[PDB]
Design a protein around this nucleic acid. Structure first.
Ligand SMILES: [Mg+2]
Ligand SMILES: [Mg+2]
Ligand SMILES: [Mg+2]
Ligand SMILES: [Mg+2]
Ligand SMILES: [Mg+2]
Ligand SMILES: [Mg+2]
Ligand SMILES: [Mg+2]
Ligand SMILES: [Mg+2]
Ligand SMILES: [Mg+2]
Ligand SMILES: [Mg+2]
Ligand SMILES: [Mg+2]
Ligand SMILES: [Mg+2]
Ligand SMILES: [Mg+2]
Ligand SMILES: [Mg+2]
Ligand SMILES: [Mg+2]
Ligand SMILES: [Mg+2]
Ligand SMILES: [Mg+2]
Ligand SMILES: [Mg+2]
Ligand SMILES: [Mg+2]
Ligand SMILES: [Mg+2]
Ligand SMILES: [Mg+2]
Ligand SMILES: [Mg+2]
Ligand SMILES: [Mg+2]
Ligand SMILES: [Mg+2]
Ligand SMILES: [Mg+2]
Ligand SMILES: [Mg+2]
Ligand SMILES: [Mg+2]
Ligand SMILES: [Mg+2]
Ligand SMILES: [Mg+2]
Ligand SMILES: [Mg+2]
Ligand SMILES: [Mg+2]
Ligand SMILES: [Mg+2]
Ligand SMILES: [Mg+2]
Ligand SMILES: [Mg+2]
Ligand SMILES: [Mg+2]
Ligand SMILES: [Mg+2]
Ligand SMILES: [Mg+2]
Ligand SMILES: [Mg+2]
Ligand SMILES: [Mg+2]
Ligand SMILES: [Mg+2]
Ligand SMILES: [Mg+2]
Ligand SMILES: [Mg+2]
Ligand SMILES: [Mg+2]
Ligand SMILES: [Mg+2]
Ligand SMILES: [Mg+2]
Ligand SMILES: [Mg+2]
Ligand SMILES: [Mg+2]
Ligand SMILES: [Mg+2]
Ligand SMILES: [Mg+2]
Ligand SMILES: [Mg+2]
Ligand SMILES: [Mg+2]
Ligand SMILES: [Mg+2]
Ligand SMILES: [Mg+2]
Ligand SMILES: [Mg+2]
Ligand SMILES: [Mg+2]
Ligand SMILES: [Mg+2]
Ligand SMILES: [Mg+2]
Ligand SMILES: [Mg+2]
Ligand SMILES: [Mg+2]
Ligand SMILES: [Mg+2]
Ligand SMILES: [Mg+2]
Ligand SMILES: [Mg+2]
Ligand SMILES: [Mg+2]
Ligand SMILES: [Mg+2]
Ligand SMILES: [Mg+2]
Ligand SMILES: [Mg+2]
Ligand SMILES: [Mg+2]
Ligand SMILES: [Mg+2]
Ligand SMILES: [Mg+2]
Ligand SMILES: [Mg+2]
Ligand SMILES: [Mg+2]
Ligand SMILES: [Mg+2]
Ligand SMILES: [Mg+2]
Ligand SMILES: [Mg+2]
Ligand SMILES: [Mg+2]
Ligand SMILES: [Mg+2]
Ligand SMILES: [Mg+2]
Ligand SMILES: [Mg+2]
Lengths: 150, 118, 59
RNA sequence: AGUUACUAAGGGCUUAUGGUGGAUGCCUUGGCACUAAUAGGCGAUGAAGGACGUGUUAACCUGCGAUAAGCUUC
RNA sequence: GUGUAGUGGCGAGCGAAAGCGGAACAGGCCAAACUUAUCAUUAGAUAGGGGUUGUAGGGCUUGCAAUGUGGACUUGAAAACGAUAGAAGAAGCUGUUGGAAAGCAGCGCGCAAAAGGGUGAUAGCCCCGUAUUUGAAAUUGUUUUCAUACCUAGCGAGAUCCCUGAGUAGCUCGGAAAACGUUAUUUUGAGUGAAUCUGCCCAGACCAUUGGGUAAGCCUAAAUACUAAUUAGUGACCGAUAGCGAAACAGUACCGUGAGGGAAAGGUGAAAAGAACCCAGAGAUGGGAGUGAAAUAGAUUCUGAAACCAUAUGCCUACAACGUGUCAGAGCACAUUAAUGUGUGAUGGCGUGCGUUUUGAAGUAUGAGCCGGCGAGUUAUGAUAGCAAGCGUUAGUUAACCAGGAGAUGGGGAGCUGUAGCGAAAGCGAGUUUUAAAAGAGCGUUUGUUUGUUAUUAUAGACCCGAAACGGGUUGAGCUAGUC
RNA sequence: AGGGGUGAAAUUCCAAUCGAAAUCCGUGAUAGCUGGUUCUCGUCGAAAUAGCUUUAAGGCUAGCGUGAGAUCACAAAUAAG
RNA sequence: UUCUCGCAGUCAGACAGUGGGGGAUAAGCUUCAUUGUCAAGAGGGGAAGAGCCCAGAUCAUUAAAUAAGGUCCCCAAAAUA
RNA sequence: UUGUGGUAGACGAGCGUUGUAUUGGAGUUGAAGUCAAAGCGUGAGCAUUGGUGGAUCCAAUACAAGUGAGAAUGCCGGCA
RNA sequence: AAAUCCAGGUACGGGUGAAGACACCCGUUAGGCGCAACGGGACGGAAAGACCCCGUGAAGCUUUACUGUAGCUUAAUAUUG
RNA sequence: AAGGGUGCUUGACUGUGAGACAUACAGGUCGAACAGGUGAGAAAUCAGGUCAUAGUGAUCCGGUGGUCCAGUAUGGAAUGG
């Protein structure tokens, strides 16, 4: 395309802009889509979100959830899942190898966890802080191995 | 970018003014009254097209009715005879015949009068 | 936009976007309800479709 | 006896012209928002801001201060 | 990081501190010990040496190694880069329309100069300039070099002695600061009040263990905030109702006792060559003449719209019930964006305006005297949904910042979304919560991300106009009320 | 000298204004209440109902409209039994 | 006309027939259920009329057949017994 | 073949103004503006000629908006 | 000059209609245009009704309405033997 | 019979719950069937309060009992779940 003839893909650039003040021929004149003389037709707006006209809102009607660990943050974990790790190409899965594969950031010290049930064909040698009993069963059903770092 | 209105309002206003040419005083001078008169005149024109279609039929019926009463026949029976004889002619052309061609109009009335239906 | 502090602490989300909630009438006046009513109100629920739209933009 | 035009004191319509008026169009020793640098003060050695006065020159504006529309030096 | 932990009549709302990525980076100095000299040395005071801390430091006594490196630092000398005036600075003629050439056409030329302004129209080569090369007697700014003051220096041994900031830290009673509506931490109006490196404070009440740090003394460049002003320049900014209220002599005229409020108004022509002279008139002025391309460009000075006021060709109108038009329709008068043409309309049929708000308006409801200009859905930051494009299954994409034209962009992977869910949570994991249960039931056992456009929405004044009001500051007792 | 003054007292007077001056500022106060909101064509096209509401001239959800997608029959309409 | 998603407007209704409540078998009254119209709908009949009857306007035609209603004149159209 | 009354409202397709970027073109042998006329379009709208006017303007494809006036006892100016 | 003014070429009777018509339906009357008068109508003009109601409006005032507070009073504590 | 009397008892249970009624939401109503351990009865069977429909109040806040959860460096505690 030249600079004197440049075109967008159809139905990508231009869409029908709803002009609210330019005449009745567009169907959006005078009132401009607000309705007629009520609260929603003034400049203020649409009240508050969640309001119910004075009736107790839904959130104010329902009991509050409880936070057992008040003031704490859940310990984040980096999880290696067995259904997808097969797609990744590597053997002897340790922290350093994941760093080279850039699954984990080198500036992170989160403990590695092993999760999954899906059967894997080739054997892998994991170095994981935590592993499920049946995930370990699947891994050791093949000729792989898992060592639990402490 | 301050777009300024000029030649846009005046052109569309002068169109309405041009349409309302020949009106009484301010009805052709001021744009507002001119616009109202054109809309009202358009409504009148629309309604009178329909009313013209009906009024000219009535006038043809009246002329045809008169042309028949001079010969002793009535409109109500003339059309019935026309239908039974299968003759299909507008009252417009029939009235035009009775005003322009008295002899041939009299020929049509003579055939519808007595000749065997079909 | 700020998430409403009352919308949270009362509405937890799920995998498919459903908004979990707790049943009301479970704070006091226990003898005025039957054990069937109490054990049915103990379980949690989800907001109805009439409120799903209003809670989605609230969270 | 019957059917009849001319009237225009004045008014209406179309078109053309003249007058009041400054809309539209073009322009601007003027404004606005910033960029890159400089600088971020003046004053008892009299400040900022004013009054008065000064011409071969009516008033106003600007400059100037009894050395008064300018004085000396580089 | 996140609108996260939290804080909120747990309502409206408010909202960090760690960590990570960047811009810049710098650490110094007193009091006390100890010692010197002097003060009727009652010093408990003055002036010096010594010292500045946490993997504790310093002083006391005793040795080795040192003559340096660096400053937030004083005076000078020299040099460089600038600022406040400037100098030089290339290249065209002919013909045509035209009042006028620079336009147009022919043939050329210069360029580190084709930014711009003027010149009788629209000029690279007519002029001033611009690119580029340069230049300061005098004042002033930045940097560098040399010298010169001031400050600035390591590692041991022994002694077991001394010093390390008091109405201070804590505590109680009322407040506050931090995101916190008072509470671990910080601060203070009243009261009380400690200890001295085996010491004191801190790690969200508090105690013990562990660890971190040295309060009650001071100074500290850089990155950061802003533009009244000076120089250069830019604008998908405005172009006399716009842009500053103010293009003009605008905070003026004017209004008010005062504080205070506050306008309108630009354009002759290339050049005044601004109309000598004649006629009418008292004169202004007008009509000729003259200049000029144009005087219907004449100082009333670019163009000159509508409402409004007058003149006239043509048609109609003085027995006529009219939202004034429409459909038919004679006669009259003309001839065009050549079209079953145009102007008027004797007469016949039909016919109670436009917006607003209402169940319902011709309305005895409302708003507009007419004309012209101005006048009301936007922007910034986020969320959802539709459409489309880029990249894709260990995906996708950068924010700040740096370089680059006030650029596209490159670097920057800090982070954000998705990849595994369930549970209040520890926790488990294609499972998980409930439960004695594996039974039953709830939720899951998959379909992504970054942009562009549109629609809606949240915070902001949020489509525009309109209150009576409230709070804070100033000006008024020249009118009037009281008193002297 | 103004949440003040003065008042032989009437809500008098305080610069033609006084149930509490004038002016500037917060300020573009707020208004569920009036008024206004500017070009065109085509397709489709409502409601004035229920519950709650310090709610009754307002608001939320449901009912009725519109755009996109799915469901082909077992879904939904019109007649007969 | 069922299900899912985006965007709404509506919460003042009116009259006519039919079955009732309140009123007095009064109201162009008020409150309900149901069938229609108007609201948001012109045309023809009703002399004139938002809601009654006939019906549903894409534009042009000086074409034809009809619905409610009507045929002495206004005003289109009739005659017999 | 079935359709095309319509307010609130939903959806789709377009016109017009100013400027910018790429192309091309017109203009003192007369551009914009401005007036008149017996033209062309389904609609916003678009041309042709002549008078006045004296220097800029037009067409196409995209982009950005202070982008469309008949009403607000709307503001300003003029005139009834 | 002035308020006023949607454009007007602006009759009466009965009826109708948003329920009291210069403009609608049916009839009657009326040559075009002034001047001097007087006020019947144009629900005439001037004042976004002061009466009534509505607004989760304002302001002034009152009290054993609520929450506070200036001032007054009592005690502890410091100055304080 | 769902009314009256007698004997034995406490199902006036624990964890649940396919499917429906009615509903804007929040809530309400009926309930087969499963596991545990019981009561009556020889057994079949019945019992998750009464012949049925009124006898009831959300959220926030704080208190009480239990508890296989948290415990702001660690062990507790405080304070929460
Ligand atoms: Mg519409
Ligand atoms: Mg809308
Ligand atoms: Mg309403
Ligand atoms: Mg309105
Ligand atoms: Mg509304
Ligand atoms: Mg309430
Ligand atoms: Mg305009
Ligand atoms: Mg005459
Ligand atoms: Mg005349
Ligand atoms: Mg020179
Ligand atoms: Mg030169
Ligand atoms: Mg030039
Ligand atoms: Mg402490
Ligand atoms: Mg605070
Ligand atoms: Mg220590
Ligand atoms: Mg702790
Ligand atoms: Mg210390
Ligand atoms: Mg101005
Ligand atoms: Mg002006
Ligand atoms: Mg004065
Ligand atoms: Mg002259
Ligand atoms: Mg003039
Ligand atoms: Mg002029
Ligand atoms: Mg006559
Ligand atoms: Mg007569
Ligand atoms: Mg009449
Ligand atoms: Mg007539
Ligand atoms: Mg007529
Ligand atoms: Mg009429
Ligand atoms: Mg309008
Ligand atoms: Mg009304
Ligand atoms: Mg009414
Ligand atoms: Mg009237
Ligand atoms: Mg009235
Ligand atoms: Mg009104
Ligand atoms: Mg009026
Ligand atoms: Mg106007
Ligand atoms: Mg999107
Ligand atoms: Mg980048
Ligand atoms: Mg399961
Ligand atoms: Mg994609
Ligand atoms: Mg006095
Ligand atoms: Mg007050
Ligand atoms: Mg009184
Ligand atoms: Mg007075
Ligand atoms: Mg306002
Ligand atoms: Mg209010
Ligand atoms: Mg339709
Ligand atoms: Mg209805
Ligand atoms: Mg109903
Ligand atoms: Mg209301
Ligand atoms: Mg709704
Ligand atoms: Mg009703
Ligand atoms: Mg009702
Ligand atoms: Mg009825
Ligand atoms: Mg009744
Ligand atoms: Mg009744
Ligand atoms: Mg009624
Ligand atoms: Mg309505
Ligand atoms: Mg009708
Ligand atoms: Mg009729
Ligand atoms: Mg139709
Ligand atoms: Mg027929
Ligand atoms: Mg018939
Ligand atoms: Mg007849
Ligand atoms: Mg339609
Ligand atoms: Mg353009
Ligand atoms: Mg022209
Ligand atoms: Mg505008
Ligand atoms: Mg009546
Ligand atoms: Mg009123
Ligand atoms: Mg109140
Ligand atoms: Mg209030
Ligand atoms: Mg005391
Ligand atoms: Mg018994
Ligand atoms: Mg019993
Ligand atoms: Mg409470
Ligand atoms: Mg602990």
């Amino acid at each position: 395309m030249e600079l004197n003839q440049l075109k967008s893909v159809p139905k990508a650039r231009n869409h029908k802009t709803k002009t609210l003040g330019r005449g009745h021929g567009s169907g959006l004149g005078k009132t401009s889509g607000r309705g007629q003389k009520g609260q929603k037709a003034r400049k203020s707006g649409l009240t508050r979100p969640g309001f119910e006209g004075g009736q107790t809102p839904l959130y104010r009607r329902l009991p509050k959830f409880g936070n057992a660990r008040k003031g704490f943050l859940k310990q984040e974990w980096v999880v290696l899942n067995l259904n997808k790790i097969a797609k990744l190409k590597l053997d002897k899965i340790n922290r350093a190898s994941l760093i080279e594969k850039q699954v984990i950031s080198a500036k992170s010290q989160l403990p590695i966890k092993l999760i999954g049930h899906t059967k894997l064909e080739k054997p892998l040698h994991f170095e994981v802080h935590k592993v499920s009993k049946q995930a370990l069963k699947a891994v050791e059903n093949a000729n792989g191995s898992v060592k639990l770092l402490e | 970018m301050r777009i300024k209105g000029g030649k846009q309002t005046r052109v569309r206003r002068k169109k309405w003014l041009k349409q309302a040419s020949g009106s009484f005083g301010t009805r052709h001078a001021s744009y507002k009254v001119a616009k109202q008169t054109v809309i009202q005149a358009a409504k009148y024109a629309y309604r009178d097209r329909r009313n013209k279609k009906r009024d000219f039929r009535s006038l043809w019926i009246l002329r045809l009715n008169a042309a028949l009463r001079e010969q002793g026949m009535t409109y109500s029976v003339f059309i019935n005879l026309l239908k039974k004889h299968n003759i299909e002619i507008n009252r417009k052309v029939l009235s035009e015949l009775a005003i322009k061609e008295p002899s041939k109009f009299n020929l049509i009335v003579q055939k519808v009068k007595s000749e065997q239906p079909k | 936009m700020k998430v409403k502090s009352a919308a949270k602490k009362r509405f937890k989300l799920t995998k498919s976007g459903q908004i979990k909630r707790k049943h009301a009438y479970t704070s006091h006046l226990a003898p005025h309800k039957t054990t069937k009513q109490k054990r049915h109100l103990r379980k949690q629920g989800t907001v109805s479709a009439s409120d799903f739209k209003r809670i989605g933009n609230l969270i």
